[PDB]
Amino acid sequence: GGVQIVGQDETDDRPECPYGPSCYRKNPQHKIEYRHNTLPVRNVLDE
């Protein structure tokens, strides 16, 4: 199985959709031009 958030959807070069979690639009370029979740997935320790 696997129900974790290790990547979400390849969002390393995305700015930030203004709608956010309540985004009712689903276009092909809208999921690649902006991102809906700004969670940390790379810098959480720095060693």
Ligand X SMILES: Nc1ncnc2c1ncn2[C@@H]1O[C@H](CO)[C@@H](O)[C@H]1O[C@H]1O[C@H](CO)[C@@H](O)[C@H]1O
Each residue 1-40 as x (binds ligand X by CB under 6 A) or -, in order, gives: ------------------x--xxxx---------------
Q: How far is CA 44 from the centre of its chain?
A: 16
Backbone φ, ψ for residue 29 (5° rounding): -75, -20
Whether 25 has a binding-site annotation, put simply, is yes
Q: How far is residue 47's CA from residue 35's CA, in Å, rounded to a whole number?
A: 28
Name the minimum Å distance from CB 2 to Zn ion. Answer: 25
Which positions lie near Zn ion, rule CB under 5 A?
A: 17, 19, 23
Q: Please report, as ranges, the residues that interact with ligand X according to CB under 6 A.
A: 19, 22-25
